[PDB]
Amino acid sequence: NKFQLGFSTLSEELDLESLQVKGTIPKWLSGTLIRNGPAKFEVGKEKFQHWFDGLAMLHKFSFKEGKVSYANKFLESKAYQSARDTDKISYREFATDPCKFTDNANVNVTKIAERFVAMTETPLPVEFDINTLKTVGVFAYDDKIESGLTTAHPHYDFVKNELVNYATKISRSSNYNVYKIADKTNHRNLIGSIPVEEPAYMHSFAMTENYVVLVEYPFVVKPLDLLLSGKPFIENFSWKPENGTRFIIVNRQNGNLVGTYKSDAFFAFHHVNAFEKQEEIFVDIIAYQDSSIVNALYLDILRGQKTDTIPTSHIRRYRIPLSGGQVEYEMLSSEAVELPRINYKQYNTKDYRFVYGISTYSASDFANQLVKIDILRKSSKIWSEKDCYPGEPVFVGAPDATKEDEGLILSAVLDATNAKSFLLILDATTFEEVARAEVPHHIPFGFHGNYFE
Numbered sequence: 001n002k003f004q005l006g007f008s009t010l011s012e013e014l015d016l017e018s019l020q021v022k023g024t025i026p027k028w029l030s031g032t033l034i035r036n037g038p039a040k041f042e043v044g045k046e047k048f049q050h051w052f053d054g055l056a057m058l059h060k061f062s063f064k065e066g067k068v069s070y071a072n073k074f075l076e077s078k079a080y081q082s083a084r085d086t087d088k089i090s091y092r093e094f095a096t097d098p099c100k101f102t103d104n105a106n107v108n109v110t111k112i113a114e115r116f117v118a119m120t121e122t123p124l125p126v127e128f129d130i131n132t133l134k135t136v137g138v139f140a141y142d143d144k145i146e147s148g149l150t151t152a153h154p155h156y157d158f159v160k161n162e163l164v165n166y167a168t169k170i171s172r173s174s175n176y177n178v179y180k181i182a183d184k185t186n187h188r189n190l191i192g193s194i195p196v197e198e199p200a201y202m203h204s205f206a207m208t209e210n211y212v213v214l215v216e217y218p219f220v221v222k223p224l225d226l227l228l229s230g231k232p233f234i235e236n237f238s239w240k241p242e243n244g245t246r247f248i249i250v251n252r253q254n255g256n257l258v259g260t261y262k263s264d265a266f267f268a269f270h271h272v273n274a275f276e277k278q279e280e281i282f283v284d285i286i287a288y289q290d291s292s293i294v295n296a297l298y299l300d301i302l303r304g305q306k307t308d309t310i311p312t313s314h315i316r317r318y319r320i321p322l323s324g325g326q327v328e329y330e331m332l333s334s335e336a337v338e339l340p341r342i343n344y345k346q347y348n349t350k351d352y353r354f355v356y357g358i359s360t361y362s363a364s365d366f367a368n369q370l371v372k373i374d375i376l377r378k379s380s381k382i383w384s385e386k387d388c389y390p391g392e393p394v395f396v397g398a399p400d401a402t403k404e405d406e407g408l409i410l411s412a413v414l415d416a417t418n419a420k421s422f423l424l425i426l427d428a429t430t431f432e433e434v435a436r437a438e439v440p441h442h443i444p445f446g447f448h449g450n451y452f453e
């Protein structure tokens, strides 16, 4: 297992004004890339069981006139602080329990009320200073919306300047609570509540011009099992394919229920994009046949000699006829893909042509390719390098760009032979390297990051 290092702890935290750059970083890149992910997979003798359990570490790539600065710090969550100060796992994670939700916000980062927050799937984000990467603390919402489970995949409406997300109240009468947050406030407005007997694990959701679409995979929990069983969070979820998948369509301006539609069972972590066209909604999803991927992302499998056991996902375009009818899909590409990203700022909620992601096709290795899928031409461009494992491709559009793929792709890449990571900058159009910046250590395999101007 050459990539074993990507799932090993990084204890080193440093701050460097300049990384060694090769190539040239465009002058117009003047923002900051923040990467989030797990970077500590044990506390004393106690090991975290699952990739999703690792204690959050932020990585900062800040750009000035062709130079790039780097800093990394562990998020000083109560989860981290308690582990550091008692050498005991102290909060319940995705798949590990101690020997009252974790604030181990290891999944994604965004801005709420002009503040930088790290996010996981527990109710409250964790605020951090982008200058220092210091932790300010739990970011409280100012509202009466009940939640136990949420996403670290909020959507953002650039027209209305609203963050959009949902949170599940998990109780004997559970609710999916769809909400929005206006710029310069931490108050969430409830759009709508959908009552549900057995809440589904929905890592992300779709947003169109007029709608939120919750795609309810039949991977579901009995609320009382979560409240009372001895078992870590994710062990309480069951695959029930007889339920099918349910597309719940909510008007995200007035909370009206547009309708519910069923397809055959499938599972997904990541939506790609969705859009309305005539009397139809198209929903592009990185779909697995079932939920078995969840058990494949336990560390003993990820570190083991059986990684061809890890199920592949593919881009499915689901067509919802609002007129009425069963939801059918077609494949947009033959490539196995995860960690999808688009020209979000210009093409989220809109008809589009280009998806960036990591190849999980295993042509030559595990997760060793960046891929750019051309939906129109049904073709792909590939980036790879011997014994290198690239992270999520973050797209940044060029100034006054007239094309969907005019800009840069930023990917944190593990170099296994060098036992250190580099930031790869591709031109999004050619999908060829324009620069890289060396990091003095390995960046463990992370989840999501965002570029802030």
Ligand SMILES: CC1=C(/C=C/C(C)=C/C=C/C(C)=C/C=C/C=O)C(C)(C)C[C@H](O)C1
Pocket (backbone or CB within 6 Å): 052, 053, 092, 093, 094, 100, 101, 102, 106, 107, 120, 121, 122, 123, 148, 149, 150, 170, 203, 226, 227, 232, 233, 269, 447
């Ligand atoms: C939400 C909830 C709980 C905690 C859930 C937790 C720790 C979820 C973590 C999700 C993560 C980190 C997912 C990451 C996905 C990345 O690709 C209790 C504390 C285990 C029980 C409570 O009733 C409900």
Ligand SMILES: [Cl-]
Pocket (backbone or CB within 6 Å): 172, 222, 223, 224, 225
């Ligand atoms: Cl129950």
Ligand SMILES: [Co+2]
Pocket (backbone or CB within 6 Å): 107, 153, 203, 269, 270, 447, 448
């Ligand atoms: Co995710």
